[PDB]
């Protein structure tokens, strides 16, 4: 990291976090592959930090960590992690033609190797990602609120390249994303109430204080106590 302050927005945010963890089964019968739309809304610890800001500009350092376990010997399997950006077609199946795509950047890695690692660049068409969007996506009234179409990174599709085997093994794909070259604009209040969804900023609050709707800080007896 290597600054002086430790409160630099580079230092405050460039910190690798488990953004996605999904096992998928693999067998000789015909999802058998991993697919995840790249966002940060999935885990509330990273989400509240990035929602301190209105606009963020960063590269994304993905690190795919892959373990295998029995349902003798753990097989050495080849995996394909393929970044499908916004505008390109995603694989519907594990054996589809979209895995053979010349233009979708793949990476071919083994379980025996050190974990695969790519840097996804700044994929937005605007000059920053909109963490908060006060608007509607489509030009109709049927558009969704708070979803900027320019804000989507892409999809991270992960499959097992090997042919189907009768053996029973579960492949768990931990995805670690670490922002880089963070520029951040227009700081915001930190969220006090718990999240209800990842699609929006709805709020309910807890039942009692702290972090309740009508009492964010837990009470004391009197003001003079």
């Amino acid at each position: 990291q290597h600054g002086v302050s430790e409160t630099l927005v580079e230092n405050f945010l460039s910190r690798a976090a488990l953004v996605s963890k999904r096992s998928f089964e693999y067998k000789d019968h015909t999802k058998n592959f991993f697919k995840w739309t790249i966002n940060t809304r999935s885990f509330v610890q990273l989400r509240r930090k990035l929602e301190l800001f209105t606009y963020l500009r960063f590269d994304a350092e993905i690190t795919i960590l892959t373990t295998v376990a029995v349902n003798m010997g753990l097989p050495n399997l080849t995996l394909q992690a393929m970044f499908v950006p916004t505008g390109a077609l995603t694989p519907e199946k594990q054996d589809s033609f979209h895995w053979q795509s010349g233009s979708n950047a793949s990476v071919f890695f083994k379980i025996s190797d050190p974990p695969a690692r790519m840097t996804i660049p700044f994929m937005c068409i605007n000059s920053a990602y909109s963490v908060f969007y006060d608007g509607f996506a489509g030009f109709e009234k049927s558009g969704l609120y708070g979803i900027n179409p320019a804000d989507t990174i892409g999809n991270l599709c992960v499959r097992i390249v090997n042919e189907h085997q009768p053996v029973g093994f579960t492949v768990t794909v931990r995805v670690y994303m670490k922002p880089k070259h963070i520029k951040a604009w227009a700081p915001r209040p930190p969220r006090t109430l718990p999240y209800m969804s990842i699609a929006n900023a709805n709020y309910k609050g807890k039942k009692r204080a702290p972090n309740a709707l009508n009492a964010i800080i837990g009470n004391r007896d009197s003001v003079k106590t």
Binding site: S127, D134, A186, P189, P190, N202, Y203
Partner: protein, 200 residues
């Protein structure tokens, strides 16, 4: 004084083409008031020269100059937080459905804060001074003036689909007087700065 109509900088920014205040309807502030909000440029899309520039062009690029004035006697008390919130994605209370088009695009009339303590988006009103803001303590002053720059990652934008700034006026200390039946008007005047439009 801008144009023919007569009556601080956000983040240290001064925005630099038609070159006046659009005085909105006065809202009436009482003891039971929670707050008021106006989304920009949605509050100005159906009004005047700016409304003719919005409805006939396709992209807008302009800053805003807001004068909030709250006119009361010396026997009134109360404090307002006149705060401008960039990209105020509103949340809905106690549901998973996102707010609709009617809940967000209120027009010239604007809206009312349901839960102003959380700024209607799960954040806090206590930390809402991280935005460009001014206080109207009726003991001390009666007016506020906030300059609003072009707040967008994009170079130009869609006025009918997206509202960059939200002007919020939230009574932190409620309106007080002895006979608690008095009202105090709040008048909002919004002047657009550097009205750039494209796609006639």
């Amino acid at each position: 004084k801008l144009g023919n109509s007569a009556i601080c900088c956000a983040y240290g920014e001064w925005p630099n083409q038609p070159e006046r205040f659009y005085t909105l309807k006065s809202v009436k502030w009482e003891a039971g008031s929670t707050g008021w909000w106006w989304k920009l440029p949605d509050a100005l899309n159906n009004i005047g020269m700016f409304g003719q520039n919005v409805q006939h062009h396709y992209l807008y690029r302009s800053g805003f100059l807001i004068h909030v004035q709250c006119n009361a006697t010396r026997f009134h008390q109360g404090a307002l937080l006149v705060v401008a919130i960039p990209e105020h994605q509103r949340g809905a209370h106690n549901t998973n459905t996102s707010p609709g088009f009617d809940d967000i695009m209120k027009g010239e009339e604007g809206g009312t804060f349901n839960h102003p303590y959380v700024l209607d988006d799960g954040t806090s009103l206590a930390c809402a001074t991280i935005f460009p803001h001014q206080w109207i303590n009726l003991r001390t002053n009666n007016s506020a003036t906030i300059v609003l720059p072009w707040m967008n990652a994009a170079p130009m934008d869609f006025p009918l689909r997206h509202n960059q700034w939200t002007l919020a006026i939230i009574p932190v200390v409620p309106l007080g007087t002895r006979t608690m039946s008095s009202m105090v008007p709040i008048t909002v005047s919004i002047a657009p700065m550097c009205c750039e439009f494209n796609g006639l």
